A paper describes a structure:
We solved the structures of efmSHMT in complex with pyridoxal 5ʹ-phosphate (PLP) and (+)-SHIN-1 in the absence or presence of Ser at 2.28 and 1.90 Å resolutions, respectively, to characterise SHIN-1 binding to efmSHMT. In the structure of the efmSHMT/Ser/(+)-SHIN-1 complex, the covalent bond formed by a Schiff’s base relocated from K226 to the amino group of Ser. The Ser amino acid forms hydrogen bonds with E53’ (prime denotes the neighbour molecule) and H122 to stabilise the 115-loop, and the carbonyl group of Ser also forms a salt bridge with R359. In the structure of the efmSHMT/Ser/(+)-SHIN-1 ternary complex, the serine residue on PLP formed hydrogen bonds with E53 and H122. H122 is located on the 115-loop, and this hydrogen bond stabilises the loop. Structural analysis revealed that (+)-SHIN-1 forms several hydrogen bonds with amino acids in the 115-loop. Loop stabilisation contributes to the binding affinity of (+)-SHIN-1 to efmSHMT. Furthermore, the competitive binding assay showed that the binding affinity of (+)-SHIN-1 to efmSHMT was enhanced under coexistence with Ser when compared with Gly, while that of Me-THF did not change. Furthermore, Ser binding to efmSHMT enhanced the binding affinity of (+)-SHIN-1 by stabilising the 115-loop. However, there were no direct interactions between (+)-SHIN-1 and Ser complexed with efmSHMT.
Residue numbers in the entry:
A (entry chain A): 3 to 411
B (entry chain B): 2 to 412
The structure:
């Protein structure tokens, strides 16, 4: 009824609802939040200005909003064991912006993971604030094993003498050894920052080593494997850093927090404390490993580094005679959503790429088990091997319909 | 009902905040009540979509319908303010201003911006904010006697300091801002002009405040103050080269994925503001504000900064009552009237004590308050602050608040 005033907007949202229902979402950074998370984001908390921190706000009327933010803060400490948490960052990018401000000065040397090797844009890309503001030096992966070589990282750190080392990634499927990163940073007198955005849910479930005890500052988003609303978060065990973090977020780089989104964070953090979340996180990894097995045994879908320890995988598609952009377009035509993605030592443009990234958090939330993840990987192989054969692409599109109807939203 | 069972802590707190919004007078000048549609958009499944890039130029697929939503927000923003280009992705007004500075100046450049005590925003050059840390801000303020901007003093400052950029706009300034004169001063010294119209955006949309968009190289705003939309930011320009720098600065410059469920809410609110009834709402905001100023002017103890309002807000120096702004804020909150303490021009107290409070009418006007009701609010505020903790008087104020909130219920 409130929809009648604006039929064009609500029609577009209606089609987006159907698109999420009918497509297989394999974008590693996406998920489906609960009804309760969306209700919190749709709450009247959007009306409240609440700059400052609980008990020390710059506006009247915040005494009940402060409960909501305290719940999000305290549940983050329960989930990750951090002594201090800041839940106001609007995004992972803002969380990383504030983390750097608390740790280094403009122009300082920072060692972070190269984008082609799997790092995030905010880990030193020259088109991002990170590369523009600080002197970033990149580390990568080994050309043959495509995993991090910690002796090479050590050599790099000693050569460049960074003030800060950043660990974490957007497209790295293997266990990150935070203990070794901390050893290297200590060796050269650098601080350590970990961006666990992609693996935060796995960390919360005990299925990836926890960076919080090792890093000066841990950042994360709330909307990937944590299955919360879109937003950021910063964690630390040092009260001196917590004060700099809090000042950097506000008044440093943000103004009013999004308290309806922070309520969604509180909701999602409590869901993550439930034992069911550990089973969900176990299923994520089992599903990713099952898919990786199919791609390892298929002709032309080369899995970067040959295995996965977490929720995602990179597929090199060069032997199929296509680039990542064409692989993404083929799979879209059969209702399978991935993203083109640079692979280690990428030689093509970042907008063409030699690969695609696939992750299992979203389909696992829909209910997919290992046999269903196997079927998904077989449909992906079939569609990419079907050199424009309309008969086989329609068979794949049929198999996708079978899966989406088997696991509705 | 069932999802609320899993988490009583969270949902009981939200229920208490619903009751507080219903039962209080919300006089925070930057707050409003958004429509059911706006909140439904924010509560939609668009929160699940990663959509980095811009409509038609995303970095990956599945964005066909998100592109429709974001283009609706862009197109209605263009129509609302008459701008040739809009960027609707900024997470907030602070992010909008961050990206606007990146499109206009280089780190270390000299910028003229309104002093915080004089009414400017933190992002207009405060040294504890990224603005004051990243650029060389020279502040202009208001005159000590009239408490309004002296444009000859701005011109003198501009000529003396040769700024690369002049910033106009305010958080706690109740008078009309003469954008034409800012453009004249910027042209004279060869500076660019940036206008942050967050507070007055809805008044501008309604033609009730001079429009900065024709005069400013870049105009920024929030969507949640007088525009009555979701919490977020927006950037406008008529220059195609600037529009490209703006888009690059927002992403991949300072943000990652946009909040498309919030952007859906921006589209909803922009169409609401395009309705003719939004003009009548905006007229009533100003008439209510002027009605309150007349009451505060007559009352001894509540000194209105500059003695008048041209827009939605007023700044009240409370020192003659023997209290500071923090004490006034907590007196009012104890009788269910919600304001914020606020520095006044040439503020002599700590920024966390302050000499004043700030009051605005957009929220109560959205509830349906007319000039008669606005007069009654101002009388209640005067009575609470003069009561010197006489509980007879304070309880009468609480009754008056309850009378008004029941006369004008939410939804
Ligand atoms: C958007 C983004 N932010 N951080 C990222 C991305 C990714 C991405 C994807 C693409 C696809 O056209 C381009 C870029 C890009 C990088 C530099 C310049 C221009 C474009 C980046 C992915 C994970 C979304 C990417 C890859 N590849 C990984 N490594 O990190
Ligand atoms: C939060 C904010 N952002 N931009 C603003 C604010 C205001 C505000 C209020 C307060 C209340 O104790 C303190 C500060 C403050 C300024 C500098 C350093 C430390 C604190 C600022 C108002 C509009 C919310 C304010 C005032 N006064 C001005 N004019 O603009
Ligand atoms: C490690 C890490 N840190 C930060 C961010 C940025 O989060 P934001 O999109 O909330 O700004 C991302 C987003 N990652 C997205 C691309 O932006 C992805 O598809 O993987 C990230 O992976
Ligand atoms: C002119 C202007 N520009 C920018 C911003 C920042 O918007 P944000 O809170 O969405 O970051 C504000 C916020 N204004 C708030 C204080 O932060 C207020 O209560 O007035 C503003 O007034």
């Amino acid at each position: 009824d409130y929809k009648t005033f604006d039929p064009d907007l609500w029609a577009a949202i209606a089609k987006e609802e159907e698109r999420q229902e009918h497509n297989l979402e394999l974008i590693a950074s996406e998920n489906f939040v609960s009804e309760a998370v969306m209700a919190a984001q749709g709450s009247i908390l959007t009306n409240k200005y609440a700059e400052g921190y609980p008990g020390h706000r710059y506006y009247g009327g915040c005494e009940f909003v402060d409960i909501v933010e305290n719940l999000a803060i305290d549940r983050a400490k329960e989930l990750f064991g951090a002594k201090f948490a800041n839940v106001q960052p609007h995004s992972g990018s803002q969380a990383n912006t504030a983390a750097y401000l608390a740790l280094v000065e403009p122009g300082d040397t920072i060692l972070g993971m190269d984008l082609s090797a799997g790092g995030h844009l905010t880990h030193g890309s020259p088109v991002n604030f990170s590369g523009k503001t600080y002197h970033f030096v990149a580390y990568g992966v080994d050309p043959t094993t495509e995993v991090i070589d910690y002796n090479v990282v050590r050599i790099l750190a000693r050569k460049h003498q960074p003030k800060l080392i950043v660990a974490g990634a957007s497209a790295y499927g293997r266990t990150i050894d935070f203990a070794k990163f901390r050893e290297i940073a200590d060796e050269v007198g650098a601080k350590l920052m970990v961006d666990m955005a992609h693996i935060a849910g796995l960390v919360a479930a005990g299925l990836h080593p926890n960076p919080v005890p090792y890093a000066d500052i841990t950042t994360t988003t709330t909307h990937k494997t944590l299955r919360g609303p879109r937003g950021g978060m910063i964690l630390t065990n040092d009260e001196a850093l917590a004060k700099k973090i809090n000042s950097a977020v506000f008044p440093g780089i943000q103004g009013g927090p999004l308290e309806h989104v922070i309520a969604g964070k509180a909701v999602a953090f409590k869901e993550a404390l439930d034992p069911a979340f550990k089973e969900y996180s176990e299923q994520i990894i089992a599903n990713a490993k099952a898919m990786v097995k199919v791609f390892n045994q298929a002709i032309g879908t080369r899995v970067i580094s040959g295995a996965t320890d977490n929720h995602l995988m990179l597929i090199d598609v060069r032997e199929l005679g296509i680039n990542g952009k064409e692989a993404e377009s083929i799979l879209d035509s059969v209702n399978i959503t991935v993203n083109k993605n640079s692979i280690p030592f990428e030689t093509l443009s970042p907008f063409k790429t030699s690969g695609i990234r696939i992750g299992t958090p979203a389909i696992t939330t829909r209910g997919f088990k290992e046999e269903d993840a196997v079927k998904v990987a077989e449909l992906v192989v079939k569609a990419l091997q079907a050199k424009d054969d309309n008969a086989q692409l329609d068979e794949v599109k049929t198999g996708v319909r079978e899966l989406t109807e088997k696991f509705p939203l």
